[PDB]
Structures are given as structure tokens and as C-alpha cells.
Amino acid sequence: DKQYISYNNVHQLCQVSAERIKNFKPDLIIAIGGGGFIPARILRTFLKEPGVPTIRIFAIILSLYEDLNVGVKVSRTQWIDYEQCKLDLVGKNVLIVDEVDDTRTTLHYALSELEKDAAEQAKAKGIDTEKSPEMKTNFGIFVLHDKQKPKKADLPAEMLNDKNRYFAAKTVPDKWYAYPWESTDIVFHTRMAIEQGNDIFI
Amino acid sequence: DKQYISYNNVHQLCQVSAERIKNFKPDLIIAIGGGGFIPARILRTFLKEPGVPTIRIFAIILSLYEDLNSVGSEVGVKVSRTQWIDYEQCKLDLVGKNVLIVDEVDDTRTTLHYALSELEKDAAEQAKAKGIDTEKSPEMKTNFGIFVLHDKQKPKKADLPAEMLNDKNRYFAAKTVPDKWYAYPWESTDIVFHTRMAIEQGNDIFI
Numbered sequence A: 001d002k003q004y005i006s007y008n009n010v011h012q013l014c015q016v017s018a019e020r021i022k023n024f025k026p027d028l029i030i031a032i033g034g035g036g037f038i039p040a041r042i043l044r045t046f047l048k049e050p051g052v053p054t055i056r057i058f059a060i061i062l063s064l065y066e067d068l069n070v071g072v073k074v075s076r077t078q079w080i081d082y083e084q085c086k087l088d089l090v091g092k093n094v095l096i097v098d099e100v101d102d103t104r105t106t107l108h109y110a111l112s113e114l115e116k117d118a119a120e121q122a123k124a125k126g127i128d129t130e131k132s133p134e135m136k137t138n139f140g141i142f143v144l145h146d147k148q149k150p151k152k153a154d155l156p157a158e159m160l161n162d163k164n165r166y167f168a169a170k171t172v173p174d175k176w177y178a179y180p181w182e183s184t185d186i187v188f189h190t191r192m193a194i195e196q197g198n199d200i201f202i
Numbered sequence B: 001d002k003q004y005i006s007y008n009n010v011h012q013l014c015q016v017s018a019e020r021i022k023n024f025k026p027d028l029i030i031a032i033g034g035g036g037f038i039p040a041r042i043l044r045t046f047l048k049e050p051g052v053p054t055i056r057i058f059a060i061i062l063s064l065y066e067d068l069n070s071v072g073s074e075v076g077v078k079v080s081r082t083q084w085i086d087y088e089q090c091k092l093d094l095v096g097k098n099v100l101i102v103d104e105v106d107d108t109r110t111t112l113h114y115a116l117s118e119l120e121k122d123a124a125e126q127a128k129a130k131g132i133d134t135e136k137s138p139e140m141k142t143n144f145g146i147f148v149l150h151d152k153q154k155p156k157k158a159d160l161p162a163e164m165l166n167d168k169n170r171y172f173a174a175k176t177v178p179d180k181w182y183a184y185p186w187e188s189t190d191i192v193f194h195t196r197m198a199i200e201q202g203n204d205i206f207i
């Protein structure tokens, strides 16, 4: 019942999504862990317009841990040092990238944590984003697969009902998906991907 | 001419390099340009063992050139980055760490020489700031390794240390290759054509 995804499939999924993602006009990309790292790079190829610079990709890791005497908390295993990076989130379009939305908890908390970063950086400079909305950080999400299961966590209604804020390359059935970069036998992996129709689908 | 490289070819190139990269024992992997992202993440999969932590991967721009819009579908395009745009980005904790620098191709070697020099300066500056003498406590040194998919058989415009190059456990080229233009699959805007050409030229599966 495992679904095998080939590299060529992923490439195409990023290719067909790039057009609607350009409407979001991302200023930077934040790729979650090992899953978002490659999708983010492939997107970047199709986001590059003649004349405008190659946008930065930032790699983060979120580790979730359970109740501890109202919610599941997060440790920032790998984060952005905005000080040494010289990265202002204020007034930017930020695209969060991962491979799969499963229960939606990782994306929910990644967004929550990054919204915290954005607000704290704006209040440090004395900016009220509700009085001046042009300096507000605009978050978008790109994912390859959004599993059609019931979610354990939510995303903002405004972002979730907008096709120019939330970008899921393909809404897929509730199955375990094997991504090509996770494979130690890529020949077998690709054979299965072609056989299952998870390859070169156009 | 133009040599098309498939994704599956890249995967296997990382596959045959992973066991010797284990001898270097990297604490982190740094992709220094667009060509290092895919190799860096595939490596992580092959470096994983039970009872061993997952290696961290970072992308830090230390590239001298770029190629994204320019494809002949001229082909052999290397455009230097304009200094009009400040590309002095993020910093990493390098002290006491084994660092694998990853890129796709060693061409004239200017990029790797530059990246190595910059990263070596960062580490030295971090060590001095913390009050560390890396000569008195050498475990605080930063050891650098380089992994590249392709290393071109041609003159080099910049040098890497001879002792590093001579050491198969410090300079890792998956394949030493003739001076041609390599089309990498993450650069393709027509992956069907790209893969088909790669298969025709024997640049797909080889294991």
C-alpha cells in the first residue's frame, strides 16, 4: 500500500505549480527539513524571471514534543539566525516548503513559529502591522502532496481557502508516499513509480 | 558537446560516494550553490545508519556563477554574479566540526577555492571570538571536506590544497569527467527530453 514517487514526477509537480506560485511573488523560501529541501530547489528553477535575482532558500528543522502541563510544543532544532543572516521578514512574501501535508501539524507549527519571528521583528522596529498593512509578513505554503485525510491541526481560514496562498501540487489519497530521495535502491523505486503511475504523468 | 544527466544518475553518483564520505565523518553538509541541494539530501539518506544521528544540511550561497534561465532547448553558459547585489548571507557554527562542502561540478575550481577560503575564515573568526586557540586545543579545529558529482579533466584557474586533493577521504569527486557541458536535471525545463537524452548518452543508471 506504499506509494513510490520518482524524481521525474517530483520535477513535474514543481513545474506545474510554479506558474500559480509566481502569483504569490515569493521573496524568500523556507524549506522544512529533509522533505522541503529538494522541492524548494526545483521550484527555484521555474520561479527565476529574466532580470530578478535568485531568491534565498532557508533550511529549518522543527521537533514536536507532547503535553507538559493545552497544546503540543516545539523545539527549534535548526533555525534562521536573522541577526547574522540579515534577513528581514517584515514586508516580505514568505513561502514555506515541505513534501507532504499529512496531519498538518508540522505546517501549522512552522507557520506559528515563523509568525512569531515576523511579529517580534516588527515590534522591535516599532511597527504596527494592523495600522500599516504594507509591512505585514505574507506567508504562503507549497507542498507536493496534501493527503485527503482529516487533519489533526488547522491553518488560517484565509490562507487555506485561497489558491494563491496555499499551494498543494496534488491532493492525494491517504497513503504512505515514498519519496525518491529517501530511497537506497532507486532502480527498484523508479520501477514501482512507473508501474503505479507516479512518474512522467504528463 | 552537451551531456544530459538524469536524477537517477545523480542518486547513484551519491550512492557510490557515501561509503568513503563516512570516513570523513561529517557533522554537517553545506550546499554552496543551486547544484548542491539535490546531492546533499541524497547523501544524507546514504550516510544514515542505526544508532547514528541524521546529518544536518544547510544552504549557504558561496557561488561565483549561476545558471537557471539560460538553456539551449547557448548551452555552455557561465555568468558571473553581479556584485551590485549583496550576497553575504547566513553564518553557521563551524567550531570543532567536520564540514562537507557540496556542489555539483568542479570546473575551473574558482568556486570551491573561494567557498573553502570563506568558510575557513568564518571558522577562524568564530574560534577567536570564543577565546579558543585552535593550536593549543586542535579538537576545536574545523575540518573541511568537498563532495562534487563531477570533476572536469582540464586546467584549473584556482587551486585547492594538494594534500586535500590527493586524499580520497577529503576530496570526493564521484566521477572525474572530460571537459564538456553537463546539463543537470534540476536545471531542466523539459525533464522528459532531458531524461531521454541522458538515457541515450549512457548518463542514467550505471551500478
Ligand SMILES: Nc1nc2c(ncn2[C@@H]2O[C@H](COP(=O)(O)O)[C@@H](O)[C@H]2O)c(=O)[nH]1
Pocket: A035, A098, A099, A100, A101, A102, A103, A104, A105, A106, A107, A175, A176, A177, A178, A179, A182
Ligand atoms: N516519506 C513520507 N513522509 C511523510 C509522509 N506523511 C508524513 N510524512 C512526514 O511527516 C511530515 C508531515 O506530517 P504532518 O505534520 O503533516 O502530520 C512530513 O514532513 C514527513 O516528514 C509520507 O507519506 N511519506
Ligand SMILES: Nc1nc2c(ncn2[C@@H]2O[C@H](COP(=O)(O)O)[C@@H](O)[C@H]2O)c(=O)[nH]1
Pocket: B033, B035, B064, B065, B066, B067, B078, B103, B104, B105, B106, B107, B108, B109, B110, B111, B112, B180, B181, B182, B183, B184, B187
Ligand atoms: N550546468 C552546468 N553548470 C556548470 C558546468 N560547469 C560549470 N558550471 C557552473 O559553474 C560552477 C563551477 O564553477 P568553477 O568550478 O569554474 O568555479 C558550477 O557550480 C556551475 O554553476 C556544467 O558543465 N554544467
Ligand SMILES: [Mg+2]
Pocket: B033, B034, B035, B063, B065, B066
Ligand atoms: Mg553553481
